[PDB]
Amino acid sequence: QLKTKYNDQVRPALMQQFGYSSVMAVPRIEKIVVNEGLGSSKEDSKAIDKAAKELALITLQKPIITKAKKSISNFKLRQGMPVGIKVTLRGERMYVFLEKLINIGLPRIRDFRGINPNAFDGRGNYNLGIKEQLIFPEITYDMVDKTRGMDITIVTTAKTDEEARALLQSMGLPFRK
Amino acid sequence: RRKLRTRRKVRTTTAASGRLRLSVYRSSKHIYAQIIDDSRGQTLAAASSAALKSGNKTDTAAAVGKALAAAAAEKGIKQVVFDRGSYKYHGRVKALADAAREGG
Amino acid sequence: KRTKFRKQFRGRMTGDAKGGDYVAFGDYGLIAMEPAWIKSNQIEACRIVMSRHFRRGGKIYIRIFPDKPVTKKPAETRMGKGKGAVEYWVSVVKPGRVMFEVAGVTEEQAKEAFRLAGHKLPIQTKMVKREVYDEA
Amino acid sequence: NGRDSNPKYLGVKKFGGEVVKAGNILVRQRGTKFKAGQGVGMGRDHTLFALSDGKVVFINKGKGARFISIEAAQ
Amino acid sequence: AKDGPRIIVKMESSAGTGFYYTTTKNRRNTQAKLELKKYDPVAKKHVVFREKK
């Protein structure tokens, strides 16, 4: 269930190279944020509950349905009822999912060279380039409604984008080559 | 967030009560509970987990709660008082209350 | 000239010129000596007048501008309310305020081009040069 | 149009330096304009009133720092 | 205070009997679930009976 792999080798690699005042000054990962917008799904009272089971069965953590705020949007925004779903993964439950995806889920994408290496968050944080929802191991074309996808954000303690992609090594870090 | 405390500290209208203020402050596994004169710019009777390790398990607040209770009762001065902070009730903080309240 | 959406109405009062400078945006400029209203036209004709005497060049600057709406009798009497929304728009100017300014033309060049625009103006005026330099 | 309505009478009833009784009204204003200080209460309509007889005094620096308070005499 | 065919209503209270009244304004807007509340009559205190009609 990992968490050992972050320990030892990941830390000194950047610490014995670029240097750090501490093992605490070493870049970390606080939380993996997973949110699937259901806005494209107008099913609402019918099938909105289905996407909750999708995210709950994969991360073993119940999703919280987000809300409208009702906005305007000039085409569709209304009141209220959910408009999307949300789950935050931190600690070992982040480390159960994160390891599960990089070893298993990521190779399941067709012609996968890895996510865009260009600057994501100058503050050091990182996203996921997930397009399809079917690419995940638990999801298959066997059981689905339609073809959709969800977004995932890696929240890291990296102080720089330079040191961001640096920590982002180890864990399954493909590139543009 | 840092308005957690200042929601409570202002929640008690101080000199309008006629009472005194008892500030319990937790940082480490140690707690310092001190009682302050609101009207005047001063404090009255201190306590601490500092010279302590009375109990091993925090809930050693029982001692410092009773320590204040006794240290204050020498000055007289027992009504209600009782400030609090960003910290909730029950648990470790109520081990302090019942050590003072009913213990003082 | 007449502008986009507003508060729509006004009364009247008069002080002395507040936000008009001595100089700006050019060598020579025009300054009003009497408290008054200037309309959407007038200054519109003043631009046309001045520019006609130039090469048509875009060297002219108009610091003034109509804001204040004025009203009029629909037909007559006192029957009914206050009325007359669009009658004309005016711009109040107070003495010492600088009205127009020109660029790059010579001395007599802008002397005569101010003089032509001197008429068409309800007030007496005098042109100028720069000594006081204020930008902040 | 012609539809404006009523006077509403909001003011500062007892100005600083004055000797209030118990129950007198110190200020009538709209929402918060003056904050109730020592010895001063506040009602539904806001509108500070006197909790204890004595001398009324005004305290402010800036903003919403305005305060009305009482103190006794003897 | 004015009354018509419309939504909400004026509804009286129960028997705190005592044969007693309260009558707060009410509404059928939320629900027709009726109602019961707590009040005090001549007899005792807090005898809590049901909104009538």
Partner: protein, 61 residues
């Protein structure tokens, strides 16, 4: 231009700017202006000082 410094014996009583280089649409900015003896620019370097304005043009009726 406000500039500054150093000697107020030698103060820059004027500023010489050569315009023969520029023709039409050319905006000469404040970083192009010559200020000897280390007189730091008061305003932004890219602020426009001299710009030659194009000939009067019209098309539609």
């Amino acid at each position: 231009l406000q500039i500054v410094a150093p000697g107020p014996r030698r103060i820059p009583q004027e500023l010489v700017v050569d315009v023969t280089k520029m023709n039409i649409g050319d905006h000469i900015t404040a970083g192009d202006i010559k200020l000897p003896e280390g007189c730091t620019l008061a305003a932004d370097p890219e602020l426009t000082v001299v710009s030659v304005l194009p000939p009067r043009l019209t098309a539609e009726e």
